[PDB]
Amino acid sequence: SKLPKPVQDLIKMIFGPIDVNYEKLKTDIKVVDRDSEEAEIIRKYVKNTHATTHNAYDLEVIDIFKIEREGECQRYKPFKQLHNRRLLWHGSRTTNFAGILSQGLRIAPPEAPVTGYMFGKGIYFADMVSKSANYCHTSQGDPIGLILLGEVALGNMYELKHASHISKLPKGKHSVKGLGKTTPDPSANISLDGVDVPLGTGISSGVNDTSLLYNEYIVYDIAQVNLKYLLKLKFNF
Numbered sequence: 760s761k762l763p764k765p766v767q768d769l770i771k772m773i774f775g776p777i778d779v780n781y782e783k784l785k786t787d788i789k790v791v792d793r794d795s796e797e798a799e800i801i802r803k804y805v806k807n808t809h810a811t812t813h814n815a816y817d818l819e820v821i822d823i824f825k826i827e828r829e830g831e832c833q834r835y836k837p838f839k840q841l842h843n844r845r846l847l848w849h850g851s852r853t854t855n856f857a858g859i860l861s862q863g864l865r866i867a868p869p870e871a872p873v874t875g876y877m878f879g880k881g882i883y884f885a886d887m888v889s890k891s892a893n894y895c896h897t898s899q900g901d902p903i904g905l906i907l908l909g910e911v912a913l914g915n916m917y918e919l920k921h922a923s924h925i926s927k928l929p930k931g932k933h934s935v936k937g938l939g940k941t942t943p944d945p946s947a948n949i950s951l952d953g954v955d956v957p958l959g960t961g962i963s964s965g966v967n968d969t970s971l972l973y974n975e976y977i978v979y980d981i982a983q984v985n986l987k988y989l990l991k992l993k994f995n996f
């Protein structure tokens with residue numbers, strides 16, 4: 760195999776023929792240099808946005824891959840100049856990833872139980888790395904999970920303090936923002952490739968009347984998303 764070792768180990772993790780397995784993903788995976796500025800930005804995003812009620816583990820980046828799914832860029836194109844783009848987290852159980860890369864992130868079917876989906880059937884993201892890492896569900900026996908960074912064209916946000924359970928946005932809105940009591944420090948956000956990186960440390964958002972501790976970002980068209988990076992994570996408890 761001509762693949763770089765990190766890519767081969769990631770292939771092993773997601774699938775359990777290494778190059779055939781890699782081709783099965785229909786995804787161009789490349790490794791990010793440990794000494795680059797891209798990597799430093801991603802690691803600072805991980806460092807500063809670890810919530811304080813998620814102190815059961817202590818994160819630690821292992822590998823950082825830049826991923827490009829086939830068609831995802833030409834499918835995301837129409838929503839690109841859409842203002843308010845943000846680079847956000849998405850966690851999921853490891854076995855799901857072999858699919859997430861081949862099919863992309865998807866929405867629950869049109870007739871599933873909308874209960875459990877606090878803000879209706881959509882694609883969810885968080886600006887606190889730990890809020891998403893919780894969904895990797897990585898225990899002490901298997902303390903390695905995968906988490907995605909995605910450019911999300913949030914557009915005009917419908918800001919909500921409580922649950923809705925509906926997937927229909929008031930015309931003029933492109934995404935939902937569940938307002939958390941704690942938000943990344945906006946005085947520290949940067950703009951990487953024109954995408955807003957909210958890597959600021961956790962501060963108080965100023966909203967008292969709200970159900971969520973940390974912000975949630977939901978979209979409802981799967982083409983509002985563009986997966987940029989993929990992270991191997993060591994969970995230390």
Ligand SMILES: NC(=O)c1cccc2[nH]c(-c3cccc(C(=O)N4CCn5c(nnc5C(F)(F)F)C4)c3)nc12
Nearest residue numbers: 848849850851855859865875876883884885891894975
């Ligand atoms: N994980 C986050 O980054 C995340 C961040 C903030 C709020 C959130 N709410 C939910 C959520 C809300 C409702 C249902 C589920 C849930 O069972 N899955 C659906 C399937 N699936 C999951 N994680 N990935 C996927 C998949 F779409 F790729 F298949 C878990 C998950 N996930 C988040």
